[PDB]
Amino acid sequence: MNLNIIMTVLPLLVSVAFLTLSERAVMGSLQRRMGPAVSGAFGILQPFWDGFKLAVKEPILPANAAAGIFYAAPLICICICVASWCTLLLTDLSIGGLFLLLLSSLAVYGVLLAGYSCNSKYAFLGCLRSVSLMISYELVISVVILCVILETRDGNGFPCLNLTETASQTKIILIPAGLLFYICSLAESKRVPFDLPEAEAELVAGYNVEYSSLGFAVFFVAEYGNTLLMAALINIYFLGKLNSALIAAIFVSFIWVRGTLPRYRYDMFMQIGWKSLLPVALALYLAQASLGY
Amino acid sequence: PKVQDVPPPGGFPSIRIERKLPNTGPTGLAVFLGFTAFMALAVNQARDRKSTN
Ligand SMILES: CCCCCCCCCCCCCCCCCCCC(=O)O[C@H](COC(=O)CCCCCCCCCCCCCC)COP(=O)(O)OCCN
């Protein structure tokens, strides 16, 4: 192997933990509260307490569910997040962003498998709703990526989707497509506007709620990791060369938009993605295609 | 006793009860003109890039 994997994984773990801390620090600031102060003094150590405590809690034996699939769902998500970040930072793959798109279509499996574990009639509909949201806004993400590839060419003039080459130049023409990429990124991370779960999940309709140990931990960590990956993609594609500050700022923007916007009903968000976002992304694609090379 | 909480002589100063309508600011036309200008600048940048490449 290579020493680079350590230099990628370790920063991701630290960053995700502080992402979780940031989420509440911002929400408190918006609501005239303060960042948690009983865990320590600086507050740097607040997430480690949660993770270490979650480790201590006594394991619960699985009930009325297949053991393999139950173990598989965390491994699948923890694999997709790692492969994504390590193909975003440590690879030269000509169609690397297309690979990231493929890796984002595989995030649907973890939710679906979690829903299957419940094996409840209500949970079957609830998981179908979540996966419907992910596939519906993944189609729009694919069209946006198509718009990204029309404007991205390498020095030798060969069309491609290399993250380094798309990052090298900042194109203001793509900004109309970056707004759609940002809305879709909110959808794929199940943020508040597209957060169908929370209303349905107050009762045990079905979700990752079942886990309550190292299994639940990875899911939440992966959620923030995916959100940060989307922020990185927004930076690399529409905002120039990769900047750590920009990735953090985009995450903060996600939290801000979350706070300021109410959630949508099932039909409403899906109607937005099919009859609003998709026609706009197709018009932007045809316009960019017609502008030419 | 004979001294109780009574309103001050002359009454309290007036307060505001009705809502304030603050819907002043940018409207649709300005956004359209700004978007049109930004798009034209983007098209010029695109053409320059497409030629240099
Ligand atoms: C008009 C100019 C003429 C030229 C023609 C060009 C046409 C526009 C092309 C420009 C490309 C940019 C478009 C921006 C995305 C908006 C998509 C269309 C707008 C729209 O339909 O409104 C709602 C979609 O926005 C939503 O409500 C999505 C949910 C938003 C939640 C999250 C928002 C995040 C913050 C916004 C992004 C900002 C990025 C950085 C903060 C639908 O709703 P509807 O039902 O009313 O429409 C149905 C009415 N029949």
Retrieve residue A226's tokens: 């995916």
Interhelix angle for A214-238 vs A4-30, to 10°? 90
Residue A26 makes CB contacts below 8 A (sequence gap 6+) with A252, A255, A256, A259
3 state SS for chain B: CCCCCCCCCCCCCCCCCCCCCCCCCCCHHHHHHHHHHHHHHHHHHHHHHHHHC
Residues with CB under 6 A from ligand 1: A 176, 179-180, 182-183, 186, 193, 253, 257, 261, 272, 276, 280
Residue of B nearest to A154 (CA): B53
Chain A and chain B share a number of CB contacts under 8 A equal to 23
* DSSP at A59: P
Tell whether B43 lies on the interface with A, counting CB pairs under 8 A: yes
- What dihedral do alpha carbons A227, A228, A232, A235 form, nearest 10°? 80
How near does any CA of chain A get to the CA of B43, in Å?
Answer: 7
Task: Give the mutation candidate from B31, B49, B52 for the A interface (greatest A CB count, under 10 A).
Answer: B49
Task: Give the mutation candidate from A156, A172, A290 for the B interface (greatest B CB count, under 10 A).
Answer: A172
Query: In angstroms, rounded to a whole number, what is the distance separating the alpha carbons of residues A292 and A285?
Result: 11
Query: In angstroms, rounded to a whole number, what is the distance separating the alpha carbons of residues B20 and B17?
Result: 9
- What dihedral do alpha carbons B3, B4, B9, B15 form, nearest 10°? 160
Residue of A nearest to B44 (CA): A173
Q: Is A141 helix (H, G, I), strand (E, B) or coil?
A: helix
Q: How many CB atoms lie within 10 A of CB A202?
A: 8
Contact A173 B53 (CB under 8 A): no
| Torsion sign across C-alpha atoms B31, B36, B39, B45 | negative
* DSSP at A213: S
Retrieve residue B5's tokens: 């909480």
Query: In angstroms, rounded to a whole number, what is the distance separating the alpha carbons of residues A150 and A287?
Result: 11
Q: How far is CA B38 from the centre of its chain?
A: 22
Residue of B nearest to A290 (CA): B43
Resolution to 1 decimal place, in Å = 3.0
Residue nearest to atom 37 of ligand 1 (CA): A179
* Alpha-helix residue ranges (DSSP H) falling in chain A: 4-30, 46-56, 67-89, 96-105, 107-118, 121-151, 163-168, 175-188, 196-200, 214-238, 244-260, 266-272, 278-291
The answer to whether A86 and A8 have CB atoms below 8 angstroms apart is yes
Residue closest to A169 by CA, chosen among B29, B21, B22, B42: B42
Q: How many CB atoms lie within 10 A of CB A262?
A: 7
Name residue, tokens 């793959």: A93
Interhelix angle for A214-238 vs A175-188, to 10°? 180
Retrieve residue A113's tokens: 């498998």
Tell whether B49 lies on the interface with A, counting CB pairs under 8 A: yes
Retrieve residue A228's tokens: 């940060």
Experimental method: cryo-EM
Name residue, tokens 């309103």: B7
The answer to whether A172 and A287 have CB atoms below 8 angstroms apart is no
Contact B45 A172 (CB under 8 A): yes
